[PDB]
């Protein structure tokens, strides 16, 4: 028991990934190319509401049966999503896959979006959004993408306020009809045999072929959105256009990430291997945090740093975070730093797959934006195959490129993008 990872690709462009690891539990999923990215000023938040609508009645199963049915076999059903991808997955013990599958299939391909059900559901965007925004972390990221873009990616991941209660069954339907198309969907599935997961995708996945609505290109703006709100702690993020998914310059940044520092590895411990952390450390005296921020999207990406700090020290802390990026673009990168990083990155990657969830995510992410499974050795080969120069170049691209900044808290002492 240990081998393979088959992956068919039906007539309509619907990719099917599969891996049997004989786990006592299965986890099937439907990855899709959809999100606030394909929203227009006209239907904003419709993707968010769609996310919360997963439990509404479908043409095959009712709101009631979905929840009762899944819970009956100790299953689960959830929808995770970024600005450009939406995953509908379910978990359960091996012996119930066929049962949980029905609802999964129904939810993604047969929604009904009954007006009343939809009307009652909307006041929920208000809640859902309120708990998310408890983390300042999420607020600035929203504004970041809004300051870093003029469209598509500039769209918020959480339905804007003015639109709560105004989304319509039409919009939900159109959004689904124009995006949930066989050529934009992948039916991944850990803990199952490939023939089985395939026979399913066939006889049942109705909404056939297409590519429907195509997202507008990700135009880069380079703006600065600031939020004065009193908070004793100031969260700031300064980024630049970075590499995109499947980009050669990607692996470069990812490595520059770890070199600068991307999250602690030792509990309550200091990060010495983190140039950025250590840099800021020598600058401020009070508590703070600083990390390398790095996002890779389909046709774009963002790269820079993120910093949490006491209001009166945001100045010194952000500058320090900068000087440490310039110092790195001017060849301030040892050949060893590049070696350490490469390991942290490989390990980080490798650990980030022990989770059933993490693995399924990994597998399906490829089978959707590719149709193939890059072997672990290959991804390893691609990572270390990054010169010390590539890294100092990535750094350069940042110190040079047009920067966009998003900050929030008591900005009374926070610098403006043009003072960096």
């Amino acid at each position: 028991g240990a081998e393979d990872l088959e992956i068919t690709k039906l007539p309509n462009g619907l990719i099917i990934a599969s891996l049997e690891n004989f786990s006592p539990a299965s986890r099937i999923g439907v990855f899709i190319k959809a999100g606030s990215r394909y929203e227009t000023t006209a239907n904003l938040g419709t993707a968010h509401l769609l996310r919360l609508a997963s439990p509404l009645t479908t043409k095959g199963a009712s709101s009631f049966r979905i929840t009762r049915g899944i819970e009956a076999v100790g299953g689960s059903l959830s929808v995770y999503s970024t600005r450009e991808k939406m995953t509908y997955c379910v978990e359960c013990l091996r012996d119930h896959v066929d049962t949980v599958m029905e609802y999964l299939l129904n939810v993604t391909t047969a929604p009904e979006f009954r007006p009343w059900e939809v009307t009652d559901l909307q006041p929920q965007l208000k809640v859902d959004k309120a708990v998310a925004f408890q983390s300042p972390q999420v607020g600035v990221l929203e504004n970041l993408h809004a300051a870093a873009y003029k469209t598509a990616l500039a769209n918020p991941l959480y339905c804007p306020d003015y639109r709560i209660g105004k989304i319509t069954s039409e919009q939900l339907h159109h959004f689904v009809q124009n995006n949930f198309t066989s050529a934009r969907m992948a039916l991944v599935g850990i803990g199952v045999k490939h023939s089985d997961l395939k026979q399913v995708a066939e006889q049942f996945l109705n909404i056939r072929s297409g590519a429907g609505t195509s997202s507008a290109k990700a135009t880069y703006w380079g703006g600065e959105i600031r939020e004065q709100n009193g908070h004793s702690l100031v969260h700031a993020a300064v980024v630049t256009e970075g590499a995109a998914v499947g980009s050669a310059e990607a692996n470069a940044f990812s490595v520059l990430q770890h070199v600068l520092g991307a999250g602690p590895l030792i509990k309550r411990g200091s990060s010495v291997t983190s140039k950025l952390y250590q840099g800021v450390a020598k600058a401020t005296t009070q508590p703070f945090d600083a990390s390398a921020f790095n996002v890779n999207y389909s046709d774009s990406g963002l790269f820079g740093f993120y910093t949490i700090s006491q209001a009166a020290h945001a100045g010194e802390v952000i500058r320090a975070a900068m000087n440490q990026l310039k110092a790195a673009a001017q060849g301030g990168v040892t050949e060893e730093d590049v070696t350490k990083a490469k390991n942290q990155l490989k390990a980080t990657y490798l650990m980030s797959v022990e989770t059933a969830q993490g693995l399924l995510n990994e597998i399906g992410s490829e089978a959707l934006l590719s149709g193939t499974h890059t072997a672990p050795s290959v991804v390893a080969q691609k990572i270390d195959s990054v010169t010390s120069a590539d890294v100092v170049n990535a750094a350069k691209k940042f110190v040079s490129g047009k920067k966009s900044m998003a900050a929030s808290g008591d900005l009374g002492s926070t610098p403006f993008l043009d003072e960096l």
Binding site: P24, T67, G74, G75, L93, V127, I266, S270, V272
Partner: protein, 444 residues
């Protein structure tokens, strides 16, 4: 393909071998390039006393600031540079320090571990700094109503005993603990017979134990040194503690009766029971159709922001209860419905209910072994608490034998007509009278 039954059988066995110093080494070898190894210690605040309370926590803060063989900077740099993750914690009866790295470094890891538990530097200058840090973490944790509540629940449920103390300790203890007390704590508690080195991922049990024999030396002389100390029993008390602050936005309430303790088989039924009641929170999409009656009610009548059942076990005792968060004006109805559900458990559980509770429980146990850290956490605990590993195959066996009739009896036996322990914090005026609550403890 393969059934749930078979997949359970084909799970690689957990190997356990004891050394001569009394240390036990256990592991579950998988085909994974990454792994987790750590030491789970049978120590915690319950082993502390009135004067060193908070030592084990103070020790947790130093465990990583370097050993004698390799100082702070050196230590951190060595772990970071290999891409390994170092973490740990300390509870009332259990402490742990574990690392996540590539199986390739399994031995270098083991060396680091043993260096940590056996050679903590306890730098005098460091202690004065962690002193200020811990004092800050106290103020932070003070604003976490959920933990403030469970602390209070212990403070009263086990009033006048060791289990009544928090893990972090007191402001005084923290302001005065000494290099000695910490040293003493370590020398007194971190000892082979009371420790377990568990590992999971791609590791050779044999390579592990070899690397173990090599770094876990300290071999005891007297009979005292290798005997595991039995703790004095903690008396449970039906009682309440009400910390009122109307200025807080929502109220927290936790209610619990005394549990059986790790070794008891009933814990299996208790967990099934908690599964029937389950949990909720305003972001559950199932909403009004959730199978949990309490959940449905909470939804239908806007009873709370959330609620959870729990069955916290300990060696000789435990806490079986529930905790909920509600607005000042719905505390009463929530409590009313909650206790109502407990009464249903004792008097009218359905085969349908248990049938579903069991599946939820199975998925739960399986979900606790999703990764190396969680599998390693299980091993460290199972050994420390059951003195062996209980495979999913066994759990499942036990879980499947549970039926309505059994749930009712077990629940009746632990819940029916018992004086519970209650902790309430926040704008709790609408929740009231121990007497009234005590009456919710009988007649369905």
């Amino acid at each position: 393909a393969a059934t749930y039954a078979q997949t359970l059988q084909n799970i690689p066995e957990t190997n356990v071998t004891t050394l001569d110093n009394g240390l036990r080494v256990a592991s579950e070898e998988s085909s994974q390039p990454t792994c987790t190894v750590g030491v789970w210690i049978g120590a915690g605040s319950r082993y502390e006393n009135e004067k060193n309370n908070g030592a084990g926590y103070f020790v947790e803060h130093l465990a990583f600031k370097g050993t004698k063989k390799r100082p702070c900077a050196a230590f951190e740099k060595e772990v970071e540079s290999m891409g390994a993750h170092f973490n740990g914690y300390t509870s009332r009866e259990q402490t742990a320090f574990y690392i996540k790295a590539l199986s390739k470094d399994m031995p270098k890891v083991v060396e680091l571990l043993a260096d940590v538990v056996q050679n903590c530097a306890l730098e005098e200058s460091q202690i004065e700094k962690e002193r200020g840090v811990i004092l800050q973490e106290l103020k932070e944790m003070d604003n976490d109503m959920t933990n403030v509540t469970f602390d209070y629940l212990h403070a009263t449920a086990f009033q006048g005993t060791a289990l009544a103390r928090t893990v972090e300790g007191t402001t005084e203890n923290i302001k005065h603990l000494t290099r000695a007390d910490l040293a003493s704590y370590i020398d007194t508690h971190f000892k082979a017979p009371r420790m377990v080195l568990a590992a999971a991922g791609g590791i050779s049990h044999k390579e592990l134990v070899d690397a173990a024999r090599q770094h876990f030396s300290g071999v005891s002389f007297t009979y005292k040194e290798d005997a595991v100390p039995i703790l004095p029993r903690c008396r449970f008390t039906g009682s309440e503690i009400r910390a009122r602050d109307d200025a807080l936005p929502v109220a927290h309430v936790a209610l619990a009766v005394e549990g059986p303790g790790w070794a008891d088989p009933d814990n299996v039924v208790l967990h099934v029971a908690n599964a029937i009641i389950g949990r909720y929170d305003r972001t559950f999409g199932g909403g009004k159709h959730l199978s949990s009656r309490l959940a449905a009610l909470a939804v239908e009548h806007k009873l709370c922001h959330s609620f959870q059942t729990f069955n916290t076990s300990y060696s000789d005792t435990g806490l079986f209860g529930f905790h909920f968060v509600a607005d000042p004006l719905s505390i009463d109805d929530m409590m009313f419905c909650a206790q109502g559900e407990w009464m249903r458990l004792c008097t009218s559980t359905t085969e349908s209910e248990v049938k579903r509770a069991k599946n939820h429980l199975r998925s739960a146990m399986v979900a606790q072994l999703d990764g190396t850290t969680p599998v390693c956490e299980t091993i460290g605990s199972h050994l420390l608490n059951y003195g062996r590993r209980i495979s999913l195959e066994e759990w499942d066996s036990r879980i499947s034998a549970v039926d309505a009739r059994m749930v009712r009896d077990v629940c009746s036996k632990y819940i029916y007509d018992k004086c519970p322990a209650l902790a309430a914090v926040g704008p709790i005026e609408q929740l009231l009278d121990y007497n009234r609550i005590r009456s919710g403890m009988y007649w369905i």
